[PDB]
Symmetry: C2
Subunit: 111 residues, 2 copies
Amino acid sequence: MILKRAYDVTPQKISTDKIRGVHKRVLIGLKDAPNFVIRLFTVEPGGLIDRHSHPWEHEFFVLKGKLTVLKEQGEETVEEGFYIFVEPNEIHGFRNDTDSEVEFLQLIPKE
Amino acid sequence: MILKRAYDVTPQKISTDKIRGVHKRVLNFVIRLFTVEPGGLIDRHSHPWEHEFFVLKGKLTVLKEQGEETVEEGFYIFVEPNEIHGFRNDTDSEVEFLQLIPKE
């Protein structure tokens, strides 16, 4: 087996036209042996992953804080301990409406 | 899209010769959230599917084909198909972890 500390993985700060205030850690990447992509996202206060979609299904698990989830036709705020399933091509995004860092896992089954 | 609180799933207690002090919530693929009581044990076993784990709470002792390793919340684990593994809680508080099993 492999056993590693998620927070030791190098964080990639992302700042683009549709993502701000976000760091990404690739725990299990596209090119690794396991059949699951696993990323840990840290969202700064006011950070935003704008609405978008991908033809693959995503799962998410909220590790710390309150995470606002953007949807095609609205939004909903959840907190640590929630899990989220996003179907293929389904619009989704994220926002941190709090004064604290919010953390969540992104899980992608490899096809 | 589905948005649900994992801890609202009612846990199933697991009591076998090789599993004690353990509760499981089920959240293609499967994702489960395990809670291990102090002194709880998931004895060494294997399955033909791979496993990934993410430790949510506490200090988790991982049983391997050669030896043991204690990790804590924030660690993640990959277990190859058919690799013997297990878990023990050597602490006095509850330990929690996610288990992911891909179908492929």
